């Protein structure tokens, strides 16, 4: 498999900071491009691949980018929000994962002027899709853990989506596998068009964090607050 080096560079590029410290001329050595990932995820900012970064860049993430072409403003503008579950994850009964995207959605719709209703039609302006490797985005997931997930900022067509990666194991967190009702609630996140916190215990932290608590912080509802009127 790759080198800790290899690793590092790889997760450095594909998450957006590679790109960044080449704008500020320090593409070189890896050094700057540390700097703004541990600022980003809130490590101890050493500028070192030390043991809490290489700890960070294994752990399983959102396949959204952290730092920085869709169309439009990046916002919902009707209130009635529709999903379609397009297809299913076997690994699951599909009355539980309705009930994982219902909940994930009755957490935001609590918080925001939006409302979320279920449909069946290729027009919902979330539409729910599992898929593996390449699956129609040319975002393609990465086998077995990393990419978790990804979606779209509101807009037209594919903008609003939310994917699962399908070679996870998905069930409720508990015993084995990522918790596809966490995972939704983030992904559909990035659905009304919040972008990744640098809290480690919000939702909107990109990397997965198992808990049977409550899971929006102060952080979420205030990036929603920030903005729908
Ligand atoms: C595979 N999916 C995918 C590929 C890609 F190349 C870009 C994006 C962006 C999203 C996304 O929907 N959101 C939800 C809406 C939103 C809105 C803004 C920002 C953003 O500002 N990014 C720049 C860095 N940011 C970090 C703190 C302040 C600036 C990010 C996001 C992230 N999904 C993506
Ligand atoms: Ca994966
Ligand atoms: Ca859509
Ligand atoms: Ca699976
Ligand atoms: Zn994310
Ligand atoms: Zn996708």
Same mark, same amino acid.
């Given at each position: 498999?790759?080198?800790? *080096?290899?690793?590092?560079?790889?997760?450095?590029? *594909?998450?957006?900071?590679?790109?960044?410290?080449?704008?500020?001329?320090?593409?070189?050595?890896?050094?700057?491009?540390?700097?703004?990932?541990?600022?980003?995820?809130?490590?101890?900012?050493?500028?070192?691949?030390?043991?809490?970064?290489?700890?960070?860049?294994?752990?399983?993430?959102?396949?959204?980018?952290?730092?920085?072409?869709?169309?439009?403003?990046?916002?919902?503008?009707?209130?009635?929000?529709?999903?379609?579950?397009?297809?299913?994850?076997?690994?699951?009964?599909?009355?539980?994962?309705?009930?994982?995207?219902?909940?994930?959605?009755?957490?935001?719709?609590?918080?925001?002027?939006?409302?979320?209703? *279920?449909?069946?039609?290729?027009?919902?302006?979330?539409?729910?899709?599992?898929?593996?490797?390449?699956?129609?985005?040319?975002?393609?997931?990465?086998?077995?853990?990393?990419?978790?997930?990804?979606?779209?900022?509101?807009?037209?067509?594919?903008?609003?989506?939310?994917?699962?990666?399908?070679?996870?194991?998905?069930?409720?967190?508990?015993?084995?596998?990522?918790?596809?009702?966490?995972?939704?609630?983030?992904?559909?996140?990035?659905?009304?068009?919040?972008?990744?916190?640098?809290?480690?215990?919000?939702?909107?932290?990109?990397?997965?964090?198992?808990?049977?608590?409550?899971?929006?912080?102060?952080?979420?509802?205030?990036?929603?607050?920030?903005?729908?009127?």
């Amino acid at each position: 498999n790759l080198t800790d *080096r290899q690793l590092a560079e790889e997760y450095l590029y *594909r998450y957006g900071y590679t790109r960044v410290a080449e704008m500020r001329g320090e593409s070189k050595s890896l050094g700057p491009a540390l700097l703004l990932l541990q600022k980003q995820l809130s490590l101890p900012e050493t500028g070192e691949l030390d043991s809490a970064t290489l700890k960070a860049m294994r752990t399983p993430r959102c396949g959204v980018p952290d730092l920085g072409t869709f169309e439009g403003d990046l916002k919902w503008h009707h209130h009635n929000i529709t999903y379609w579950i397009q297809n299913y994850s076997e690994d699951l009964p599909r009355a539980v994962i309705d009930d994982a995207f219902a909940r994930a959605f009755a957490l935001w719709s609590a918080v925001t002027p939006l409302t979320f209703t *279920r449909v069946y039609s290729r027009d919902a302006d979330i539409v729910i899709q599992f898929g593996v490797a390449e699956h129609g985005d040319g975002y393609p997931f990465d086998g077995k853990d990393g990419l978790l997930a990804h979606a779209f900022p509101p807009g037209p067509g594919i903008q609003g989506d939310a994917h699962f990666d399908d070679d996870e194991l998905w069930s409720l967190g508990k015993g084995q596998g990522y918790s596809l009702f966490l995972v939704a609630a983030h992904e559909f996140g990035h659905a009304l068009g919040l972008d990744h916190s640098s809290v480690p215990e919000a939702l909107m932290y990109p990397m997965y964090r198992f808990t049977e608590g409550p899971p929006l912080h102060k952080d979420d509802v205030n990036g929603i607050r920030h903005l729908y009127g």
